[PDB]
Write an enzyme that holds these catalytic residues in place. Structure first.
Site, mmCIF file in Angstrom:
data_model
loop_
_atom_site.group_PDB
_atom_site.id
_atom_site.type_symbol
_atom_site.label_atom_id
_atom_site.label_comp_id
_atom_site.label_asym_id
_atom_site.label_seq_id
_atom_site.Cartn_x
_atom_site.Cartn_y
_atom_site.Cartn_z
ATOM 1 C CD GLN A 63 13.026 -30.706 12.983
ATOM 2 O OE1 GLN A 63 13.591 -29.846 12.332
ATOM 3 N NE2 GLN A 63 13.566 -31.885 13.211
ATOM 4 C CG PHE A 113 9.432 -29.027 8.995
ATOM 5 C CD1 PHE A 113 9.926 -30.255 8.566
ATOM 6 C CD2 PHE A 113 9.239 -28.030 8.059
ATOM 7 C CE1 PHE A 113 10.191 -30.450 7.184
ATOM 8 C CE2 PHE A 113 9.529 -28.218 6.728
ATOM 9 C CZ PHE A 113 10.007 -29.438 6.286
ATOM 10 C CG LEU A 122 12.909 -27.156 3.070
ATOM 11 C CD1 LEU A 122 12.118 -27.014 4.389
ATOM 12 C CD2 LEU A 122 14.303 -27.721 3.383
#
EC number: 5.2.1.8
Length: 165
Positions: A63, A113, A122
């Site tokens: 990230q 990221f 996610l």
């Protein structure tokens, strides 16, 4: 339809590591792709050049994308401070996926990221907008400077960045 490509030249305490290039999926997420493209060229007067990858978790993701702005130190978009989640058409299917970091729904700024594994938990939470084209070896090298809580062991920075095509 030809999607843009951008690059990052990565350094480790200033020592050059290598180049990562990315395809930005402007055909699916034009607003999100454009934000990242413009931050990569610096054309608005602010952007990713000189910024660090501050959170790198091996087997998960790298990230980055923070920089100083009038109202803070964690970055901003080209649309003012934050923008909405554009869509969740694309999924976090494997290594090399480029996706937006956020602080909950509709809070996209500049932080992003790069996945080093499939991260399906996610999906629907982070907007996927690109993928690594060249330099996955360099991402894997970055990953070796991370740790389980994300703190990096050396400073991993974007020495240069811009648009290739």
């Amino acid at each position: 339809m030809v999607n843009p490509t951008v690059f990052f030249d990565i350094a480790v305490d200033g020592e050059p590591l290598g180049r990562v290039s990315f395809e930005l999926f402007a055909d699916k997420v034009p607003k999100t792709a454009e934000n990242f493209r413009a931050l990569s060229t610096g054309e608005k007067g602010f952007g990713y050049k000189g910024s660090c990858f501050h959170r790198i978790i091996p087997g998960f993701m790298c990230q980055g994308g923070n920089f100083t702005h009038c109202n803070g130190t964690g970055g901003k978009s080209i649309y003012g401070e934050k923008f909405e989640d554009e869509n969740f058409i694309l999924k976090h299917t494997g290594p090399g996926i480029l996706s937006m970091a956020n602080a909950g729904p509709n809070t996209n700024g500049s932080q992003f990221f790069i996945c080093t594994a499939k991260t399906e938990w996610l999906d629907g939470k982070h907007v996927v907008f690109g993928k690594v084209k060249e330099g996955m070896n360099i991402v894997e090298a970055m990953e070796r400077f991370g740790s389980r809580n994300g703190k990096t062991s050396k400073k991993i920075t974007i020495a240069d960045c811009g648009q290739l095509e």
